[PDB]
Amino acid sequence: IFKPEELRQALMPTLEALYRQDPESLPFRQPVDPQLLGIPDYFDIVKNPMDLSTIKRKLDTGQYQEPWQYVDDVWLMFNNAWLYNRKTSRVYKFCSKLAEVFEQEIDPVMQSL
C-alpha cells in the first residue's frame, strides 16, 4: 500500500529532474497541440497523448495507486515522441536525453520502494 503523499514524496523529485532540463523538457511541458505545431496527423499516430503537465496533475491529485502507474505514464510520454518524430529531429533527441535522465533518477527511487 502506497499513500498518495508517499508517492508524491518519492516520485516528485524524478519529475522535477525532467522539468529542470532546459531546453530539453520544453516540448514536453504541455500537451502537443497539432495545429500549433503544424503536425495534422499527430492524433492518428498518437492515440494516448501524455506530457509533463498531465503527469504532474495526476501525481498531485493522487491518481497513481502504485509507482509503476507513474512510471508507465512517463514512458508513454517518451514513446509517443519517439514514435511520432523522426530519429534525426530535435524533439526525438530531446526525448532521448529526458529518458536517460529519468532512468538514472527512477532506478534508485524504485529500489527504495
Partner: peptide, 6 residues
C-alpha cells in the same frame, strides 16, 4: 512520417 514539428 510527412510532418516535422515546427
Amino acid at each position: 512520417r510527412r510532418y516535422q514539428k515546427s
